[PDB]
Amino acid sequence: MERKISRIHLVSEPSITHFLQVSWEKTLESGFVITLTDGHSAWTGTVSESEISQEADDMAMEKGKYVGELRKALLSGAGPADVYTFNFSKESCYFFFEKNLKDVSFRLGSFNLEKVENPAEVIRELICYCLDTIAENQAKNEHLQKENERLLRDWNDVQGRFEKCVSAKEALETDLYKRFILVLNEKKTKIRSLHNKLLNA
Amino acid sequence: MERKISRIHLVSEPSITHFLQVSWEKTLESGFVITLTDGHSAWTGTVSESEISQEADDMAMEKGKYVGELRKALLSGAGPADVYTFNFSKESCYFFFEKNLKDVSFRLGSFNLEKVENPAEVIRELICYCLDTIAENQAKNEHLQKENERLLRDWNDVQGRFEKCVSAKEALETDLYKRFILVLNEKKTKIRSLHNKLLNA
């Protein structure tokens, strides 16, 4: 059960910002429920899976493409180069969204919404889910920060151990090599002494 | 500028949730603004430093503890062993919160609120602020997730290379000893040949 909420500016009244919520069970392809709120009034509607197919047929485009366009539009997944226009009429109770591009607009979809009995419950539920989401995000952030501290400490310890290994390696190698050049030099001394003096005499 | 939204259950109507937001410039001592809304109408009031100080003096107790209790009550900071009761009267527009304690109630605070002339603006602003909060916290969470994944990968790689470093260190000593022995026997045969030939001659 996934719900998303977004902010949209209606064409009729640019100053105020309406708020649009979509709730779906598992996917938009299976239909969903739409509620539009203004902070003092609200409307609701459904796009049940049965309708979706007929809506796609009317649009005359790929069904997957239509569901993708709806997903990118309603869920504020719009790209920088994509602009969408939503027009809602309360006298006739319609709400249609289109995409504007190259100064020409192509119809995307249209739904009908019936005014709800009491906006208070809708607003209360919206902001309740909001507050719960704040709390959940804060808890997740705290846990992630704790894990981050753990990982940073572990990395620092690993670096220290690796440096210690380097120090041990260098010390051992240099000690052994010096200790052996001593002995080789001693033998070189004796062999030179022999080959020179004992051959001259 | 700091803000905090909380859910409360008024004793006058213990069936619906009312949402109270406290907004204070820097700290609760200077003052704050209380906005209490139930989804249809909102009441806004202000508390300045002078009234908090006067109530603390009337409270017969230190200012710091009074502000601590105020924060614990209004800012949702209540722990397990504490219960608070909020009473709101609309006819007189009078708010006051108390602390229940084994059938003993303390009148912690009594505020006066004035009904706003436009609840839609305030409700929209509240939900807008919360939506911005979620949008900003999601970015932090995803960035922290990315950083933690990167750190885990790097830590795994460094430890894996440390295994090989240590393993090679455990064999360098034999690697050195082999070569040292070999050179020693070679020059030992040299000196032996020299001595044997001279003694024979």
Of A7, A38, A194, nearest to B194 by CB-CB distance is A194
Residue with tokens 């709806």: A70
Residues of A in contact with B127 (CB under 8 A): 19, 39, 123, 126-127, 130
Do residues A39 and B123 lie in contact, with contact meaning Cβ atoms separated by under 8 Å?
yes
Q: What was the experiment behind these coordinates?
A: cryo-EM
Of B124, B155, B173, nearest to A154 by CB-CB distance is B155
- Asked whether the beta carbons of residue A131 and residue B40 sit closer than 8 angstroms, the reply is no
Give me the DSSP letters along A54-107: HHHHHHTS-HHHHHHHHHHHHTT---TT-EEEEEEETTTTEEEEEEEETTEEEE
Do residues B29 and B67 lie in contact, with contact meaning Cβ atoms separated by under 8 Å?
yes
Q: How far is A4 from chain B (nearest CA, A)?
A: 11
In what helix (H) or strand (E) does residue B146 lie, and over which residues does it extend?
helix B119-200
Q: Which residue, among B30, B35, B31, B50, has the nearest Cα to B4 in the 3D structure?
A: B35
Residue B92 DSSP class: T
Hey, what's the torsion of the CAs at B117, B119, B124, B130, to 10 degrees?
110
Alpha-carbon distances of A197 from A8, A16, A191, A193, B189, rounded to whole Å: 105, 110, 10, 6, 19
Of B140, B172, B191, nearest to A191 by CB-CB distance is B191
The one-letter amino acid at A43: W
CB pairs under 8 A between A and B: 137
What is the strand order of the sheet B94-100 is part of? B83-89, B94-100, B105-112
Alpha-carbon distances of A121 from A93, A126, A148, B39, rounded to whole Å: 21, 8, 40, 7
Helix, strand, coil % in chain B, rounded to nearest 5: 50, 25, 20
B98-104: Cβ within 8 A, 24+ apart: B99/B69, B99/B73
Beta bridge partners of B8: B18
How far is residue A110 CA from its own chain's centroid?
29
- Asked whether the beta carbons of residue A148 and residue B145 sit closer than 8 angstroms, the reply is no
Of B7, B166, B198, nearest to A199 by CB-CB distance is B198
- Asked whether the beta carbons of residue B138 and residue A137 sit closer than 8 angstroms, the reply is yes
Residue with tokens 């894990």: A147
Give me the DSSP letters along A39-59: SS-EEEEE-THHHHHHHHHHH
Rg for chain B (alpha carbons), in Å?
38
HSE-CB at B15 with a 13 A cutoff on CA atoms is: 2
Do residues B43 and B113 lie in contact, with contact meaning Cβ atoms separated by under 8 Å?
yes
A54-59: Cβ within 8 A, 24+ apart: A55/A109, A59/A107, A59/A108, A59/A109
Q: Which residue, among A112, A114, A115, has the nearest Cα to A94 in the 3D structure?
A: A112
Q: How far apart are CA A21 and CA A116, in angstroms?
A: 14
B37: three-class secondary structure by DSSP:
strand
Residues of A in contact with B154 (CB under 8 A): 155
Alpha-carbon distances of B68 from B27, B32, B63, B76, rounded to whole Å: 11, 14, 9, 12
